[PDB]
Amino acid sequence: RSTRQIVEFTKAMLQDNRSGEMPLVVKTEGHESLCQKLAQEIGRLKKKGHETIAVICKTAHQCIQAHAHMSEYTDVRLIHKENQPFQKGVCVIPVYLAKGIEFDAVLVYDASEEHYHTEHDRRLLYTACTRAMHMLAVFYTGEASPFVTAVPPHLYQIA
């Protein structure tokens, strides 16, 4: 139900039909520059018509940090419990609460090798990226997750 480009990107992460824009991978220096560039990309995606936009973090604890820092640049809804209603707009949400929800656009928060390197992490990263129906962006600080670096570079564009 996602785009061919998103399906091919995410399939390539598991090394161990509609069309859309290429997944975007974005390198950043630190959580503050990360949150700034996330905020800019959210503004771009809103203008292009995305109505449900998820910044997906690995854990609830990371969500709180992400939400606090993103709030410096834009307004974002923190998703922290199951009974929060699905609505249009921008949210910060952990993988385990995003499971089986579909968003127009997903921005993966800090897909670094520090945060995503175990096989458990691989399942979490895959789950996060497959929530995206129309646009996927993968942001990271420092060094990218091995599961991102492993994706053939023709399957994504860089910023």
Numbering used by the authors: 608 to 623, 631 to 773
Quote the study's own text:
Next, we provide biochemical evidence showing that in addition to being able to hydrolyze ATP, HelD can also hydrolyze GTP. Finally, we demonstrate that HelD can both prevent binding of the RNAP core to non-specific DNA and actively remove RNAP from stalled elongation complexes.
Our long-term attempts to crystalize Bsu HelD, RNAP core, or their complex failed; our cryo-EM experiments with the Bsu RNAP core were not successful; also, our recent SAXS-based data for the Bsu HelD–RNAP complex were not fully conclusive. Selected sequence homologs of Msm HelD are shown in Supplementary Fig. 14, revealing two main differences between Msm (Actinobacteria) and Bsu (Firmicutes). On the other hand, the organization of the 1A-1 and 1A-2 split followed by the complete 2A domain is maintained.
